[PDB]
Paper text:
We determined the crystal structures of [name] MM1309 in the [name]-bound, GDP-bound, and apo forms at 1.7, 1.9, and 1.55-Å resolutions, respectively (“Materials and methods”). The electron density is well defined for the phosphate moiety and the guanine base, but is weaker for the ribose than the other moieties of [name]. In the crystal of the MM1309·[name] complex, the phosphate moiety is recognized by residues Lys11–Ser16 (corresponding to the EF-Tu residues His22–Thr26), which correspond to part of the P-loop. The amino group and the N ε atom of Arg14 hydrogen bond with the β- and γ-phosphate moieties, respectively. The guanine ring is mainly recognized by the conserved Asp103, located in the 310 helix between β6 and α4. The side-chain carboxyl group of Asp103 hydrogen bonds with the N1- and N2-atoms of the guanine moiety. The Mg2+ ion is mainly coordinated by the β- and γ-phosphate moieties (3.0 Å) and a water molecule (2.3 Å). In addition, the side chain atoms of Thr15 (2.9 Å), Arg14 (3.4 Å), and Asp46 (3.3 Å) participate in the Mg2+ coordination. Surprisingly, MM1309 bound [name]·Mg2+ much less strongly than GTP·Mg2+, with a dissociation constant (K d) of 222.2 μM. Therefore, the present [name]-bound structure, which is very simlar to the GDP-bound structure, may be different from the true GTP-bound structure.
The putative translation elongation factor Mbar_A0971 from the methanogenic archaeon Methanosarcina barkeri was proposed to be the pyrrolysine-specific paralogue of EF-Tu (“EF-Pyl”). In the present study, we determined the crystal structures of one of the Methanosarcina [name]/EF-Tu/[name]γ-like proteins, MM1309 from [name], in the [name]-bound, GDP-bound, and apo forms, and found that the three structures shared similar conformations. MM1309 consists of three structural domains (domains 1–3), a common feature in the members of the EF-Tu/[name]/[name]γ superfamily. Therefore, we propose that MM1309 functions as either a guardian protein that protects the Cys moiety from oxidation or an alternative translation factor for Cys-tRNACys.
Residue numbers in the entry: -10 to 350
The structure:
Amino acid sequence: HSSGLVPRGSHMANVAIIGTEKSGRTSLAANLGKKGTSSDITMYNNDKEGRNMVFVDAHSYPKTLKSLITALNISDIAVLCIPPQGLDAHTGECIIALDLLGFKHGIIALTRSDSTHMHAIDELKAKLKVITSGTVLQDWECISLNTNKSAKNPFEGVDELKARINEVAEKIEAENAELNSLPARIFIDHAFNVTGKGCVVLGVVKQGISKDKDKTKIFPLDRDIEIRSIQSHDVDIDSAPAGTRVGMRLKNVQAKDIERGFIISDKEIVTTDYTLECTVSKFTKKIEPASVLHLFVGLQSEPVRVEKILVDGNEVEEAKPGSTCVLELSGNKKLAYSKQDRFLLANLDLTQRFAAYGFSK
Ligand SMILES: Nc1nc2c(ncn2[C@@H]2O[C@H](COP(=O)(O)OP(=O)(O)NP(=O)(O)O)[C@@H](O)[C@H]2O)c(=O)[nH]1
Ligand SMILES: [Mg+2]
């Protein structure tokens, strides 16, 4: 039994459209759905074509990593846009990020096809087979496409992209359905006031099934709240299973006190210090005690200091690129997480900024 006249009936896909500068990212996203929520990322919604699809354009990347990381941590499918001759620093950084995230499902969009030639496209694909070997992208399809209605071959490859997205989305729906039995957690990406309709948050159900009228908590505040209503593409729904992008009216909390990265759930760890078992990128600098890094977990980010490095339980003076270690880290602000949340570490002053992934000990 469910609300309304027709069940919402799963079908959804949360897609991140990412990549380097001048890769056609915004153009692709903007042609895949209607412009919605817009901050340092922009949602393009398309619930007109079967699935409740949302495409997130990380449009403030490469300037900021948080734009990229937010897009990726609220999405289940990544579309990496690489333009002709587009094997540059930020393309490599995107590849590294996706591989550190263990990002399962994705597609490479070889954009601007009208500006290139089949033989050049085949050479770029050959090259990519190599760069992606031994990474999570190794079996991603590469689809040549453009979003130019005036090209000789207008919008070639777009239909094939959409078809592949739908194919991948189907696999994700089944994986997300397995999570329905877990306790509910919802990651918040936006919070604002709506007139005569107070505190509203936008986010995604990460696991379980969130239900209208649930009495639960918000972290890191550690405050009791009630879910007053849940909306899915603007229609009130009684429940929202894992993978569902939601709007929620909340009781007992003001939008002014909620930030992106807050979590709705019955229980979260809240700390300002972290002990992470980490694997260090091969493409970063050795990490040393007292060094400063940037930590991402869920949709939160903040500066941290490396207090201690350990290997096999013994303290060391460095963690080299491509090594495994335990890092004891300190920060200022309280962050909320559970042990299943993957952490990323970055050095914002480097060219390739991702340093490591880790999990809380
Ligand atoms: N011929 C052609 N040009 C395209 C296509 N898609 C985008 N462009 C052009 O290439 C430029 C970059 O496109 P854009 O969508 O802004 O990519 P972006 O990666 O979002 N750019 P930015 O890094 O500034 O945010 C724009 O001038 C745009 O008109 C395409 O399919 N064909
Ligand atoms: Mg962009």
